[PDB]
Design a protein around this ligand. Sequence first.
Ligand SMILES: CNCc1ccc(-c2cc(-c3nc(-c4ccc(S(=O)(=O)C(C)C)cc4)cnc3N)on2)cc1
Ligand SMILES: CNCc1ccc(-c2cc(-c3nc(-c4ccc(S(=O)(=O)C(C)C)cc4)cnc3N)on2)cc1
Lengths: 140, 1322, 139
Amino acid sequence: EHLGFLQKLYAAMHEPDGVAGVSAIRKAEPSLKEQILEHESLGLLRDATACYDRAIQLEPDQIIHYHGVVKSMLGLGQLSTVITQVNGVHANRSEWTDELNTYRVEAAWKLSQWDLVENYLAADGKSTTWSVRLGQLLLS
Amino acid sequence: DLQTTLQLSMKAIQHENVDVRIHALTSLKETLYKNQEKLIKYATDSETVEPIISQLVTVLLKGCQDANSQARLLCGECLGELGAIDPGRLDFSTTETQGKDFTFVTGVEDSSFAYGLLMELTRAYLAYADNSRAQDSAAYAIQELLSIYDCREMETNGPGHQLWRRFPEHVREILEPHLNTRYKSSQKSTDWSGVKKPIYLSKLGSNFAEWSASWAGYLITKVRHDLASKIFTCCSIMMKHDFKVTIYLLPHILVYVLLGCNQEDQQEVYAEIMAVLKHDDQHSDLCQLSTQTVFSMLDHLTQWARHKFQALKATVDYEDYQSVTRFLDLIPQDTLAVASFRSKAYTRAVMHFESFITEKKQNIQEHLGFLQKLYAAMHEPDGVAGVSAIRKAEPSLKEQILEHESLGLLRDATACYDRAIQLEPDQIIHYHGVVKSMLGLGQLSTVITQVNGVHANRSEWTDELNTYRVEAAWKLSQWDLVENYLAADGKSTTWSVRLGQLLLSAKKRDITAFYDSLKLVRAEQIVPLSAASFERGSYQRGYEYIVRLHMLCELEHSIKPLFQDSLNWVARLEMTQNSYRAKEPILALRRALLSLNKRPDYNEMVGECWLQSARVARKAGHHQTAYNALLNAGESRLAELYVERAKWLWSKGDVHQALIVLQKGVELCFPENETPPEGKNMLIHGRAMLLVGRFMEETANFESNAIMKKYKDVTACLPEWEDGHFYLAKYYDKLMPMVTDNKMEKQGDLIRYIVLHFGRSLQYGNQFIYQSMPRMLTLWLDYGTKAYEWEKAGRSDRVQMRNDLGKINKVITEHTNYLAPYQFLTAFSQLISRICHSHDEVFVVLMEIIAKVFLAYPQQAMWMMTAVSKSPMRVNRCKEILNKAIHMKKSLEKFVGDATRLTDKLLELCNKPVDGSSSTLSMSTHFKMLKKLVEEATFSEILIPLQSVMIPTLPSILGTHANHASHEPFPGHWAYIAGFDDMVEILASLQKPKKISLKGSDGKFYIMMCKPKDDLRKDCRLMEFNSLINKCLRKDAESRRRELHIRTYAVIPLNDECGIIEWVNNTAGLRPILTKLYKEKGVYMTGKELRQCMLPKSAALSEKLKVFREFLLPRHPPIFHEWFLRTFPDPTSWYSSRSAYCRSTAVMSMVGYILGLGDRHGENILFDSLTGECVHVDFNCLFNKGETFEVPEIVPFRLTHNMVNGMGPMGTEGLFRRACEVTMRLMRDQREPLMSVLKTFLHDPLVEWSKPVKGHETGEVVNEKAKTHVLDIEQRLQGVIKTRNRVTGLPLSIEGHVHYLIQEATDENLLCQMYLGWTPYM
Amino acid sequence: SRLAELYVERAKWLWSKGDVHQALIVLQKGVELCFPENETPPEGKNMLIHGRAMLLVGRFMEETANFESNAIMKKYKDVTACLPEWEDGHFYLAKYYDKLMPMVTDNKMEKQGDLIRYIVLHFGRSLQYGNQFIYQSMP
Ligand SMILES: CNCc1ccc(-c2cc(-c3nc(-c4ccc(S(=O)(=O)C(C)C)cc4)cnc3N)on2)cc1
Ligand SMILES: CNCc1ccc(-c2cc(-c3nc(-c4ccc(S(=O)(=O)C(C)C)cc4)cnc3N)on2)cc1
């Protein structure tokens, strides 16, 4: 009855082994949120990108799932795709652009496009991500 | 009935009056929809669709190149209604009509040529009446054409006399209408002074009709032949009003112009041609048809040159021939290649490029880019893979992106697309690639937002990129978004956008827009079919569009009720070909359709559709999309979802996590609480229990009794399911050798249990018949043999054995009663092999089985028992079996008598000594008794023993009531022996065997060679095996897409040393084919210098290699490509036949390696003149008997340098290697049925394994090497290489095995050692 | 970018995916491209990469079943002759000799003397040049 709480604890502690244990213990079919938590904890990112798109289809107003999708695209090495994805999310929703600026700034300083890095940084003051800080240092 | 209906409708659709055709087609669509249940039964009840369905499919696929648009659309709708039957279920063999192949291959001055001229000009004379300005020339042209030749029906057999003979005398009546009526000729021409010298592409030659006329006239001026000049003058002017006979005469005009004239006239035509080819369209229709007619003329030129070469081989002739040959040589082959690629004549581009590479020695490496582009344009993945394997340099990124698109790996391709976007940002094809790959993985939301982003930064692109937004939207069921995106752009016509428009208009309930768009989409889909059907293997090549028609039919039938559905969706999906590309679009559209109208159970139906998608994508290997489908299949089928997840994990190799998930699901859904009797839930419980039992069997943890109890559990859950009984029985079979110490005396009751469960499984299905029946009969009969030997030995355990043998006999008797005769028919040859069993009670039971099968199918059975009936113990046993069969039904008395008489007279024919020498013996004079016998009216009708009527067709998994009874094996035409053609042909090739030709009841003639002094039992069993491999190749999606197939003739042994073999028409050995080409070239080696070239087997390998490399290979250059060039002149047929040769050689190379086929010398490999496909004969030396010869055979199969040459400039890479890998993969997947049949073949007591001893018991002759041969065959099927030689390694992969085999077969160090009769040099 | 390293890494990647055959094919194709037999690689890092690739080829060959021992031994000796200071060459040569010793000599120590000398010699040189395989070579 309490496996959800336990798995969220172990995911917060960053214990992937506890998440794997809770996964092995469940008799019931895992939720989709639990599958996403299981994949984020034990890195697959392909199982996870499938799950993220499935969640976006089921719950389309959560920024968390777009975070997941773009982070997975970034982990695979698809930088141009990441910039375009963030631009689309920004196209149909502007509020999310500030939270997703991290990934476009990272893809920009990894692609070595300093013009894009400059724009994306100028249009941000709230992000203290490691990605944005590294981008600011490289632009300086 | 509906069989009569379909037959008469098939003949009505093929009517000349297009209105009759249209009415027949409309009523046929109505009939197909109304009789959908009977048609689904026809298509799905056997492994092959009933013959009528095959005829209907061919007739429709042809009625769809018909000109009238309504007829095309109509056969398209009827092909959709009929379903997209798997091409492997349909049989298109019946329609290898000549068709495109008629007569008049080469014509120059013959009045066959003039008759073509005259009838084209009669089409013109009716085209004269169009409007009179064309009167002017058409009339006088026809008049002078009549004047030039005999224009009349003079009772004298005058040339033009028999051309009036030629004319369909309606047109010939037109000719006689005004025989001498000069229609006031123009008489006028404009001499070509100051004419635009680059004619094509300027003043008078800027359009196709005018350009053709102008160039044809300038050529008219140049020809110096007295006769040809006459008629070229004749129609000079109507070539103005006629583009088509301009097209007709240009080919010959150029021939005459070049057969000798001023050199700069030559150069004028040459520069004209080169300007046509060199010029680049867009750098409109004039380009197209200018190049097309230039190709016309050059084709005629090379054809005429070949005919001329033959004539001169059989002076002025030589000078003219050299003239036209030189003009042909002057045009560069690569110019023609790139011109053809521009024209989209891809096969012609391939022909020209290959001739360029070989004729003018060129390094293929410099031209690999063009070749990869050619093969990617032809949608030929094998050529792209071959170019990738040939290339030495590192692949460009574009060349990498092409290879991935063709080979079909979408993740690697997505990475490549991203890197490409980074490298070249403004190219749109790359964004196309990435969005296509996102859509393929099922990432639909990501596709929508990706296209939105591309739109945001570049708005121009999001009109080509709108296709993917619309597809993703109608797959998400987001109808608002579909509406927006569609309204945005009306330009796109891609299938996804048409489907989105259709579904959207169904959503809005707009009936008229729906039906208009439906007609438009159907027409668009039929358009490519009309081009594809002009072909060989047309159904499979156009299968994508037939699946689209299938989808459109399902769509319309599902939508109609909304507007104002009997279609069976499961049967319609099972017919389809087992591929991802075939079934996935269907299921996606089905989910959309379920969402369009929401019934109560659609949350469950959509889940079932997602699970079917999962199982389809898994079997194909798309584990990522399989997982996405599993995710989308939410619930309502929890048990099925757990079984699918278990199978997915198993396929990913993770058998442990698979077993864990499966046990979890089986406890969750079928808890120990309650017995699931709930029908479908009981079936799912049984399937899950069986899957668990299997998983256990592969996992090394579990005990034997645990697995056994799990299997018994499944057989108790579902007691009428074949799979449970089969797996139980084969597991018992596994554990029997261990449990009993491999001593059969204790194996008795275990054998009884195994036999019983094999038979039970057979009662409820035929899916494992080739593992069940052979093994059941083997175990029973061999335990009988053992019991007999013990009885004679006297041991005390032999009484135990008598008892348990009695019990096994009782089990086998009950099986005899319950099973259907065709099921034993599948093993009849084994049953007959065991007729000389020593134990008499075992023989009584065997006799019951054989007599049952004989009463059911007396024709097949009689043909299979002829040999043994004529063999002493074999004769007596077979006579007892026959007597029993006659006793059960006395009508068989007359048939058996007539068959024995016919057969022993055929035997006399085989053994009749040919009187001295003459290649012909008359039936009327030399035999006079076989003819009488067959001519009598009382003589029973004896089936012609072709392979189609000897090999049974087993019911399919779908068919409930067809199975185990009410199923007709051997469906299709049966042709009985109506009579003998008089002429008998003696053959000098195969050791003097006659060639009688039987006349069938249908009127067709079947050529049957009557070979003597050979035991064909081995060949008979081998043909059975090859036919099983043929079934397996048909069912496989990739095998069928490549059209892999083994050409199996019919071998019927009449006697221990005689037999009749079905002659394979239109074939010649590789050695005669090559020898003819070497003789034409004038480079040949008589037996003399071959003798002097041969050295003793004592000689060291180095001497042999030097002889081979320095004398035999230089004398025999590779020429086998010229056979393909001369036999298949059309580029389409040349390409089809070259690829057929590659695929067939590959299939039979792999199968021969598996079977140890040896003695593949020149004659033993025949090549079809019509299809290009390889046919192997003389299957005597099997299972590595070659290594026993005095000069052993060290090559796995035959791949000499001339064969590799025939394969093309890529060589063994490309199509040959990829067909080899497909065959190897399929033969490893089916290792267990193939190995069952092979075990039964290698232990056959009737096959003459050892030549009979000189001095002259039981008819049986045991095979000593049986165990060795079985172990070696199963090693080869596992990948294990005999060549250890102080090396221990793992089994080779399929690619590694194929590579090793090819490099062993083509190795010169091995070939030099082969006997010279094998002709390793040729 | 100045990379036969690229071919060695492709070969290792394919071998990791389990595709040992295409690994060997790509590696032998890239060894023939980057190190054509005409001109020897005598240079600095290029001799290093040549030796790395030749050893990787020998190991692929050893794993594959169709190759027989003489060719594998010759490849390993090639590696040790190209890079005599490198430890892996000697180690793998001696390991292969140790493996094929039982078969060649029928598991009889008497004929194993000469093979044993070669094996210990190359184990020892291995040790002289590195310690990476000390627990397999000294024991
Ligand atoms: C999304 N596709 C549709 C769908 C959805 C669910 C299922 C399903 C449910 C289970 C299941 N899995 C586990 C489990 C999993 C992982 C680990 S782990 O430690 O490896 C680490 C990866 C956490 C350990 C145990 C335990 N109990 C179970 N009931 O398995 N498959 C099948 C198809
Ligand atoms: C060889 N020693 C024993 C032996 C002898 C014969 C057989 C045998 C024959 C056939 C068979 N042959 C052909 C065939 C053969 C050759 C040519 S040819 O153009 O080379 C020209 C030189 C004749 C053309 C056609 C067509 N259809 C068939 N069924 O099948 N098995 C088997 C074993």
